[PDB]
Structure 1
Amino acid sequence: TKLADGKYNIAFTVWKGDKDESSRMNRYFESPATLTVKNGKQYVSFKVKDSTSIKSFQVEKDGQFVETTVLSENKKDNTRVVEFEVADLSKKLNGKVKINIPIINYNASYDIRFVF
């Protein structure tokens, strides 16, 4: 059941945090993600669109949301690559996104789930 070391692509979709429905956050998170399996551990990374608007992206780690790691940024196309470890790919991962639209007092939070 445990994946061999190496790099893979893994498709994913985003559900709403509290409903079994597709989340609007799908448009910002590019599937497939990259899965890096190294020394048993599993690291997921993927590109985020409209990066400047996605002020915060956290995933739940030990019953608490923690900011994801930024591996790189591309200011030209307004994207960035985020990364986090996932212990169990068969489970839905809880996440939180803070969306900021400066063109107007607009600052809202989205609860989401990653489905691999």
Structure 2
Amino acid sequence: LKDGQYDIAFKVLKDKTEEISMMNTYVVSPARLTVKDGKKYIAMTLKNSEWITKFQTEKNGGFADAKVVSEDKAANTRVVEFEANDLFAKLNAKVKVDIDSMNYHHFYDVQIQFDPTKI
């Protein structure tokens, strides 16, 4: 594909499975793919932002916090940005969730699967 901005559908999968993750409820698909100089960046909206305290994706054999490129405090959402390579390969990610009022404090591994062909 060539430089520009595109819609890309995706699903978040439970770690090491083809099952839909509980996290899938809290992301917006499609995400936005920016292609720039042969590199691919994904901008993804997280819902219930206040609950999601960390979000990381695999980068160079390690995990890195995705950049927050915008926040909407009124909507309680935010947009995070990270690099993808092969849009047909699963991307490993990590999430930390904290809901003080429900005593829910966990962190998880998940996979993101993009589907470039989907509309």
Same fold at TM > 0.5: yes
Secondary structure at the aligned position of 1:25 is classed as helix
RMSD, aligned α-carbons: 0.9
Q: Please give the alpha-carbon distance, in whole angstroms, between the structure 2 residues aligned to 1:104 and 1:35.
A: 35
From 25, 28, 33, the counterpart of 2:26:
28
Q: Please give the alpha-carbon distance, in whole angstroms, between the structure 2 residues aligned to 1:16 and 1:63.
A: 20
Question: How much identity, in percent, do the aligned residues show?
Answer: 52
Q: Please give the alpha-carbon distance, in whole angstroms, between the structure 2 residues aligned to 1:23 and 1:93.
A: 14
Name the count of aligned residue pairs: 114
Q: Please give the alpha-carbon distance, in whole angstroms, between the structure 2 residues aligned to 1:106 and 1:29.
A: 19
Match for 2:29: what amino acid?
S
Written as runs of structure 1 = structure 2, the 5 A alignment for 1:1-116 is 3-116=1-114
Q: Find the counterpart in structure 1 of residue 117 from structure 2.
A: none
Greater Cα shift, 44-53 or 14-23? 14-23
Structure 1: give runs of 5+ residues left out of the alignment: none
1:104 positional shift? 4.4
Match for 2:27: what amino acid?
F
**Which has a greater percent of strand?**
2
TM-score, normalised via structure 2 length: 0.92
> What are the Cα deviations for residues 32-73 of structure 1, in whole angstroms up to 9, with x where unaligned?
000000111111001100001000000011221111000000
TM-score, normalised via structure 1 length: 0.94
1:106 positional shift? 2.6
> What are the Cα deviations for residues 66-113 of structure 1, in whole angstroms up to 9, with x where unaligned?
110000000001000000011111110000100000114431012110
